[PDB]
Structure formats: C-alpha cells, structure tokens
Design a protein around this ligand. Structure first.
Ligand SMILES: [Cl-]
Ligand SMILES: [Cl-]
Ligand SMILES: [Cl-]
Lengths: 695, 697
C-alpha cells in the first residue's frame, strides 16, 4: 500500500520477507554503508533512473529522456524517430541542464528541527515548512564550509507527516550526463497519447544515459576531459523474468500524495478541481477536435495542444471515477470520526478542533476556489488569446528618445510567439466563444473580469460579437493589423485595444483570486500538523506512510493483473504479439518499427523470450507509485532489475488519496524487452557486454 | 466447423454429444416417430426462434423479437415499451395482428423422390432443383390434393440442402393468435441499446413473453375472443441449477444463412468488394451524419435511427474483415478445395476440379460489374436520401399530358414527396452526405460507367460536386415544399422530364438495375458448380463433420459455456452479473439507464433462488455453440435438456463464423434464465407466469 521512508525499512522488512523478499535488509538500504539504494538517482529533477553498470550507465524512461533526444535531433540525424545508439563512449552526446542526484546519506533530524523551532514566539509561523528556514538549519547542522570540504555533496532538510518528522539528505549531484541509447519513438512511445494511463500496455518506454565525472569520480560540469563514473553500486539485470504473484519492489521519488485529506477536501477536489477541469477541457477539446478533423492543416497545428489538454483531463476522469465508486470520501470520514472518538476518550480536543478548522477553511474558500478554477481552466489555459501580448511599462514609456522602435520590436517578437506557425485565430475564436459561453453562465456579472462585463453592457449578451470585435479591432487580431499599428504606434491605441484589455483584466482577476486564496492554505497546513500527529499517536507510524514530497521511497507488492469491470480480466504481462495486433500503418501512434516486426516474424528473441517462447513487453504490479516514479527500477526478491516503472492505469490515479488494491497498478516495461530492443533493434552490443546480466 | 446440424444428424452426432456432457436420451431430444424437445421449439414471427415453457402455451423469445408487438400496444397513456407490460390475467393478454409461430411437426428426407422427379429434365442446366415454386409443386404432389383442407393448420414445404444434394420435407403447424403476456422495460430488454450490439461482455435482459392461443381442440385459429390457450405436445422445464465454466450447452432454432462452402476466390470477393466497399462508403456517410447530429440536437433526433441502421451491417462487415485478415479464412477454404482436387485426381474424376475452376473463372469475370454494383448500392441507393426522391410513373407522366386524372396524378406525386421529405428529412444534411458520397463514387467509377446524369459533374459543372448538388436542390420541384407547391399549382410533364432530382434518381436506378441484370447470369453457373463441389466434399469427408449451410430450417448446435481472449492480456469470462449492469449505469444516456425496481433488487440483494452459489446475480453467459441471424430467441439447454437461457446475440469477433467457425473467438451471447425469472418475479411481479412454468431445483 505505501510509499515508505528508507528509515521505515527496519519496521517493514519482516512483512516484506513474508511476501518473498530474499535479500538482507542492509543490502537493500544501509544507513552507514553501501547498499542497492546507492544505484537509484533522481533523473533531471522529475524522474527516477538507476545505474546499471560499473561505467555509470543509467536507465530511465524514454518520456524522461525525451527532451534530450529531441535537442540532439536534426533533419540530417532524426534521433527522436530513428532512435540513437552511440557505438563508442566517445560518441555519447552531452546534455545542457541535465542532473542526476544520488542520496548519499539520510538522517532523522526531527528533534534538532523541533528544538530550533521553539525559538519561534509566533505560534502560527510557517517556518516549520519553509525551505529557506530548513536550509538555514541544514547548513548549521552540516557546517559553514560543508560543500567545499565535501566536493559534490550538499544537504537538504524536508518536512514529513505535515511537519511531525524531518529528514536531512546528503545529496551528490552530477551534471555531465550523456545520451547513450534510445529506441525509435514508434517503440519508446508506441501507444503515444491513446495508451497514456492504459493497461494493457505495449510501450518500450526506456532510454539510456551515462554519468561522467572527473578522474576521481567527483561531480564536474561537461568537459571533453571527463570520464565515466565508476559507481559504488549498480543493478544486476535479471533474465529470469516474472510470474504472476512474484514479489516486486520499487525505489524512486514519488512527487505528491494527499493521503490525509479530510472528507471535505475529497468533496472539494471532486466538485471544484476535477468537475471544472473535466467540464472546461471537454468543451475546449470538443471544439479543437471538430476543427482538427475538418482541416488537416489545423490537425498539424493543434495536435500537441490537444494532447497537452487531454493528459490531466484523463487523470481527472480517473480520480472522479475513484471518488464515485471506491468510497474515498466515506473512508476519510471514517478515519477522522475514529480519531475524534479516540481524542474524546483521551480528553484531548485538539484533534477534533483541527478537523473542524480544515472543514471551516474548505467551506469558507469554496466560492473563491470555484472562481479560480473556472478562470484558470476556462480562460488562462482555455483561450489562447488570453496569452496575447500585454505592453510592459518600459514599452508604454518609449512609445510615449526614439527607442520607440525597440519597444515595437519587443512587442513584435511577443506577437510572433503568440500568433506563431501553430496559431489559428479562427480556431481560437470558436474555442473562445464556447469557453466564454460556459464561463459567463457560471460566473455572475459582479465577479467577471472587468472586460467581460462588455458582453452584457455593450454586446447585448452576444458572445460571438464580443469575440469578433476583439479580433476586428485589436492590433494583435492579424499580421496586417499589427503592421498598421507598428507603422503609427500610439499608447492610446494599446491602452484601449480590446485584446490587451481582455488579456489584462482576465490576468488581473486570476492574480486577485490567487492572492485572496493563498492565506487559506496556512490554517489547513497548521491543522494538518495536529491532525497527522493524532493519527500517528493513535494508530502508529507503521501501517500509514508520509505523503510523497519528491524524496526517495520504497514500495513493494506483486506482479498481478486486475479486473477493470464485470467479467473482464487484464493479466499481469503483455507480449510483442500485443504490439503487432495494435499495428496500424496509417495511424502515426501505432506504427511498428520494421526491425522489430522482422524480429517478431522470425521469432529472433534469443535469451529474452519466456518459457512459452513468447516475447514479453510489459507487466503490472501492486506497488504504490505516483508522478516522480517514472523511471524507477523494479526489483526481484533478490534485488535484481526486472523492469522500469513508466506509467500507472487511470483506475489507480485516485491512489494518491486512497490506495486501490483491486484496481491500482504500476505499469512496468519488462527488462527482457529493453535488452531485446538494445540487442536486435539498436545492435548496441557494447551496452549488453558492460551490464552484469544474471543467468 | 462446429455445426448447425439437421435433426436427421442427431443419430450420428449423439455419441460425441454424450462425451461432451449430454445426459438426456437421444429420442427425448428429437424422435421422428414421437414427441421430443424438438416439439417445444417455434419459428417466432418468420425470423426469430421461441420456445414453449408451459402446458398453457407460454412462449419465450427475445425482447428485440417481440419489440414491434410491444410497440404497437404502446401509447403516451400506457407506454409498455418504456415501462414493460405484465398481464395479471390470461384475459389481459393482448392479441397481435400479422403474428405467427410455426411448429415443425414432421421432418422427412425426400432426396430420392426429388432426384427421381428432377430426371424429367428438359434442360440439364435447369435451376428447378433450387426453385421454391418447383419444390412446392413436388411437396403438394407428395402430401396430396387439398392436404390444406384435409389437415387444417398443417402445411408442407420441401427445401434444398448441401447445394441441391439433400432435400427435406417439413410438415409445419402455424398458429396466428399469439398474445403479448410479458415484457421487461426497454431499459432491461435492450440495456446496451446499439452501443453493446455484437458486444461481449453483455448485460442485456433480452426477453419477452407471449402465449399461443387456438380453438377448443388446440388447432390453429385466427384471433377470436373464443380462443383458449394451447395445450402443447411438449414444453421446456426451466433450470435454476445455472451454469459453470465448461458446462455442456446446446441450442435449437432457425439459423438463416451461412457460406461454409465458399471457394478461396469467393472469400477474396467478399473481402475486397462486398465488405471493403460497404466499410469505405458507410464510413463516409456515417462521418458526415455524426458531425451534423453532434452540431444540432434537432438533426440528432431526426437522423438517430438512420445512423443506427447504417451502423449495424457496418460493424458486421468490420468483424467479418477482421476474421478474414487474422483467422486465415481464405487459406482454410483454399486448403479445403485443394484437398478435394487431390482426392478427385486419385478417383480419376476431374469434375471436382472443373467445378472449382468454374467458380474461380465466374468470380474473376464478374469482378468489375460487382464492384460497380456495390459502389452504387452503398454509395447512392443507400448512401443518398434523394436517390429515393419521387419518379413520376409511366401512367402519371401519361395522365398529366386532359381530365381531373391530372389532380389524381399530382396527389399521388405529393404523397410520395411528403414521404421522402418527411419530419426526419433534412435537405441540408442530405446535400452534405451527397457531396462526400458522390466525390468518393466519382473517384472510383470512371466517366464511361457513370449513371448518365452524373456525367454533368464533369461536362456541365467543371468537376464541382457541390455545385452539381446545389443545382439539383435549387431548380428541382422536390428541392423544398415551396418549389413543389409551385409545381403542383401549374404542373407540366416537361417540368418533371427535365427536373434535375428526377433525372438523378431515374439515372441512378437505371444503372442499378442494368448492373443487377448484367450480374444475374453469373449466379447460375456458380450454383451448379457448387452442387458438384459440395457433392464431392460429402463423398470425401462424410455427412458427419461438415454441416449444410443454414437455410432458415431447424438445426441444433452444442458446445460449452466458455469465455475467450479477444487480444493480448485480455480475458472475457463466461458469465456477466447484475453488478456489471450497475457499473454501466448512466442516467443521462437512454441506452444505459437502469430501471429503479431493478437497482433496488440489486441493493437489497433480493435474488431468491435465482442467485449463484456465491450470491452474485447472473445476467448473461456465452457459449461455443454455432449460431447466426435467425437464432435470436433460441432455447439454450442443459446436459438434461432443461432451459438455462435464451440466445440473443453473437460477439463481433465471431461474425466471420458464417464462413468458418472460430473456436477461440466465436460465442453465442445468452440471457441467463435465472435473470429472466428474477425480472418476471421482482420487477414485473407476474407470479402466475412462474407458477405456470415447471421449475426444477
Ligand atoms: Cl555512486
Ligand atoms: Cl468426373
Ligand atoms: Cl479461431
């Protein structure tokens, strides 16, 4: 069920052994020695990766290395669709702005931090959650010259359990991380967006990097003189495969969970956050898809923006499915009723008062939060011309020296970014008319961004006329209209420009609401510190995990499918047969790499096929994962690598609030399929020879 | 492969059926000289199957089989189709006009008799051996003069089987007083509506209840208040034992058509002409229609039925093409015919090879015409509503060119215009369908082969399909009400003769009939060659492990209650539950609304003896029986011959099964008799129906 601190491995090891863990506790995590933990990295700030050779080879997801593959892709060498295989170390490609982070040491500093916080005075100081304050405390504990005396090392303190527990991490950061290997996009992103959040899955979602360092294996920025890192620990690769019910475990960096939501917060998340996102994105996506299906040129222009909107749309459909069908609200009521009853028995009313502060804060902000999500989904991300240019002060002064031309030239640049290759004013007008029609139905006049009152006042409720007028009269309405402005620019034109006044007033309302709502965060944070303290004192720090906060966690469970619905079973394992049956040459998302087809047709699976002679692609597990777990190593009972986490099924997204044992799975690319693609598709034998592959 | 067997073939099959789990004795299932379970099976209303389930003539069939009857008794006041219908007394059971139920009283092999008669050959290429007229003449001859009057309610029919190598005479007993007794609400009877058609898993309670009435003697009689329920020879016992994975199941009913003896060439033709054209042309039409329906709620209401009617055979063609591509249908027919050619050479009889060569050469020869025929039928005849706009008759053109016969000919033409341009017709939607269909049609059909009027697109309108179509509606008498009324006020023959919509409809129907007439001569040589082909197959492999094509005659099929894997890592089980109904519930989608009395039953777990051992409420199951169109309403029997369900659908993955049974994909979709009884009991509250049935533990 949980995402456990490395500190909590002692407490869980017995349970883990019962479930079939075979390795010694300290080979998995040793607080004062080298352990398997030392082979796990935070990859590029948002993913997990793992070291898989004694020359610093790193596996992570294809979607995690996507930006680095694309940044090295040209018309000449298109690595994004052809894939990339460095045939010698010297051909591995440097990456600007990349990091991998090792967790060198972890320390409980809870008492240290609570001692320091007693120098407060102000009882509702938010210093106990402030990264600046906790960094001051980290530096004090580490030393004034720590990073100078310990090259490559830094320290960080983070709050857990709502501020009831503090850990200090000693981190080692490398920034010379080179692209070694990537499958073609047809494999790395086979389902593309259609199979996002979907099990069964057939995606070979991996890419390969290498950590470089100085002659001593100490971090250094890119240099021709850097050499592969010789790490203290790397994963062995298993070719023994998985069977239904096999023990599996993951280490990685889950981003965020909401395991201590009150019932009132579940209702809020459903009825404001989720319902508004779902309603507004469905309107936006409906207009966009009509327009994409009618015009192939609009399809090419709007396809990335359509997919970008669909991704969190799907997550929200999945979350609301959990709220409706798995009793998330009811289970949090039960949790808080049980605490309140226990606090009544003990004669301590602070737990009931804490739950009541949370309910009262949620109820008080309901209207503001609804108006925020309506403007953010409806307009800020719903309407492209919400993000049209707004003149700075350094521009309006300059228009009224003769650096008039500098101001125009800056605004021109911003206009061209807004009205770029992928912008259609006609599509944006149709989307705007549909989104504004919904917004104006849901937000009363007295709550409208100032400019949107003109719909009632000037335009007699005609949303189409209001939108038509914004584009007819705006200097950003068309290239011709801007060039007329740029020739005879006056500050009076800009100050009265309908698109500028639109963009200004919707962004004013958005910030006004943001600023009104941020105060309501703190009483909930403070009440949560007391709430979670009560939950742990009542039920113990043993069957209820601290919310994810982008720190190293382990999770364990089994290779197991699930039943999505009556009379339907999804198994634990997909095969290359599943790729071939999805092949559709005319649908760019489901194209199959010819070498991979050939490999399938000729059953050229070598040592990577299963018992049956069938070629595995992916499996799913009852491990507890969330965003941040993307490139996480999946381990054997023996701690050998059996795959790479890359997704989770939509039925499981509500698992950030309440783990769903019968529906929530981690979606994992089989390491056997990873090696097959390297070997038979990449022809990159040196990478196989460099890894340690166990019979 | 796994078959639709003649009742005659039960003898030679019984042993295999027994080792598959059949317990009941052979002559309790079918006895040619006595009462058997065969006597409880009816052809329901010409197309469906039903079964007698009481000694007071109660009949079960599907909801979709009893739909029109349920609807014809529905008003705003008592909407039976929405709320269901539960006659609390026999007297309250509603008569239906134009209904029948046909019992198969006797079946007889008359092969020798028909072959003896056929020898009075003039022409050796005579198609009389398949002519229903000629076989009716041979049946009347054999049955006797005035058999009609000498045995009221009885009738005789001879049918050809195995391409004219086997003939059966059927004695049929027909009842026409068949009363509506019971129906679930539409929300149960067609729960998935069209979304779940051809879909497993399936959660539809597809049943309705009738009663056969007769005279005092239990002889057939038209409706009269004097008629009394039929006391039948035989009815089904109902089982509450239920089903488990791998249980024996069998079906009897009236499968309509199969093509089990297609050559490889005929499979290629079916795929590349019939199915690819229907798929391509209906995808164009459905695409335009859906965009118009989604943009305008009024068009949605107007075009919903037309959209749905287009989709049914669309989905079938997609399933059928999937089987051809993925299940080796073409390769298996090629192997079957290569087998017979090999055996033929060793017998020193080349006529088998000559017969397959005749079919291949005929299929090859007619390819171009048949492509043109499907293109115009799918593209225009079916594709474009204004293809079926009024055409003035010979006698209406004639009558318009000195009397008050003029106001007669104009009123005939107004009724046909009003029928075409009815409350569901949008000229604007039709113009957009027509532009897309004609563009595809004109791409595929060269100028030389176009209906004469479609030549104007090139010659008059410089290739502008939109202009051509705009012009038809602008200037045509039937382009709008105003334009017709203007014509009706001052009608000329010369107006109609040059009307562009008339010339279009006329022109496309001319070409449709020309292609049909050119294609007909190719049927006969394939039919005679098929007589020889199937003759050879029977002689080579025996009348044992290859069944005759369906031909709407009574057949039995057996297999097991078993799910299947549609694709990698996906398994569908053998049994759906009421839980699956609740999972699909969607109050804002008329297809997936859940009856409140049924939701309460689920919530209270009020299932009585109808729930399975685990206390789950079963809804539907699926079996490896071999069914097709015509098997709707068919009784599904236990190993002991007790009713365990009603067949009601088949999964899309199994539609290629009309050419080649597909053991790992093809399933009969069956409503669980336990769910039928639950719905009668706890939704209809119609206890008298339960007491009238014979229910075994
Ligand atoms: Cl290291
Ligand atoms: Cl011969
Ligand atoms: Cl099969």
């Amino acid at each position: 069920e949980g995402m456990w601190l490395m500190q909590q491995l002692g407490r869980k090891y017995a349970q883990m052994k019962e479930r079939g863990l075979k390795m010694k506790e300290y080979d998995l995590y040793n607080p004062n020695g080298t352990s398997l933990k030392d082979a796990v990295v935070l990859f590029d700030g948002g993913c997990t990766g793992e070291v898989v050779s004694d020359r610093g080879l790193v596996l992570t997801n294809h979607h995690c290395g996507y930006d680095m593959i694309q940044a090295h892709s040209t018309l000449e060498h298109n690595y994004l669709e052809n894939g990339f295989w460095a045939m010698r170390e010297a051909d591995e490609l440097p990456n600007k702005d990349i990091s991998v982070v090792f967790i060198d040491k972890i320390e409980d500093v809870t008492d240290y931090v609570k001692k320091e916080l007693k120098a407060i005075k102000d009882p509702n100081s938010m210093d106990y959650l402030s990264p600046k304050y906790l960094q001051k405390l980290a530096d004090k504990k580490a030393g004034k010259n720590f990073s100078a005396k310990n090259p490559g090392l830094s320290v960080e303190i983070k709050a857990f359990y709502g501020g009831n527990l503090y850990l200090m991490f000693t981190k080692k950061t490398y920034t010379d991380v080179r692209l070694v290997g990537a499958p073609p996009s047809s494999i790395g992103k086979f389902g593309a967006d259609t199979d996002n959040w979907i099990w069964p899955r057939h995606t070979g979602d991996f890419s390969i990097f290498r950590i470089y360092a100085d002659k001593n294996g100490n971090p250094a920025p890119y240099s021709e003189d850097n050499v592969p890192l010789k790490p203290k620990r790397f994963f062995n690769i298993s070719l023994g495969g998985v069977q239904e019910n096999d023990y599996a475990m993951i280490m990685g960096f889950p981003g965020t969970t909401h395991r201590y939501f009150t019932a009132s917060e579940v209702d809020e998340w459903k009825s404001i956050d989720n319902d508004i996102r779902i309603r507004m994105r469905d309107i936006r996506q409906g207009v966009m898809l009509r327009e994409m299906l009618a015009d192939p040129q609009i399809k090419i222009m709007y396809s990335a923006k359509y997919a970008a909107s669909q991704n969190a749309y799907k997550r929200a459909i999945g979350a609301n499915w959990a709220i409706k069908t798995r009793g998330l609200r009811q289970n949090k009521q039960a949790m808080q009723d049980r605490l309140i009853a226990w606090g009544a028995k003990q004669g301590t009313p602070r737990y009931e008062e804490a739950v009541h502060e949370i309910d009262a804060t949620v109820a008080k902000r309901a209207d503001l939060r609804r108006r925020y999500w309506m403007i953010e989904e409806g307009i800020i991300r719903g309407i492209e011309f919400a993000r049209s240019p707004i003149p700075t002060e350094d521009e309006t002064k300059a228009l009224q020296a003769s650096a008039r031309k500098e101001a125009i030239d800056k605004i021109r640049t911003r206009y061209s970014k807004f009205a770029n290759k992928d912008y259609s004013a006609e599509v944006d007008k149709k989307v705007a008319v549909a989104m504004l029609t919904e917004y104006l139905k849901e937000i009363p006049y007295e709550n409208l961004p100032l400019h949107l009152r003109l719909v009632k006042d000037r335009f007699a409720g005609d949303v189409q006329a209001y939108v038509d007028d914004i584009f007819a009269r705006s200097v950003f309405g068309s290239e011709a209209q801007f060039d007329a402005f740029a020739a005879v620019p006056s500050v009076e034109k800009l100050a009265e420009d309908p698109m500028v006044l639109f963009a200004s007033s919707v962004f004013d309302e958005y910030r006004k609401l943001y600023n009104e709502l941020r105060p309501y965060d703190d009483p909930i944070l403070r009440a949560q510190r007391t709430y979670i303290a009560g939950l742990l004192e009542m039920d113990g720090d043993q069957d209820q995990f601290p919310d994810a906060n982008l720190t190293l966690r382990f999770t364990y469970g089994q290779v197991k499918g699930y039943s999505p619905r009556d009379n339907v079973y999804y198994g634990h394992q997909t095969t290359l047969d599943g790729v071939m049956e999805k092949e559709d040459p005319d649908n760019w998302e489901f194209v199959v790499d010819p070498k991979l087809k050939a490999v399938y047709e000729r059953k050229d699976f070598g040592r990577y096929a299963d018992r049956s002679g069938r070629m595995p692609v992916a499996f799913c597990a009852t491990t507890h994962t969330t965003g941040g777990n993307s490139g996480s190593p999946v381990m054997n009972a023996n701690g050998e690598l059996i795959g790479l986490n890359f997704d989770r099924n939509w039925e499981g997204v509500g698992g950030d609030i309440q783990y769903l044992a019968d529906y929530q799975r981690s979606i994992i690319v089989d390491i056997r399929y990873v090696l097959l693609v390297i070997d038979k598709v990449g022809g990159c034998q040196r990478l196989l020879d460099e890894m340690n592959i166990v019979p």
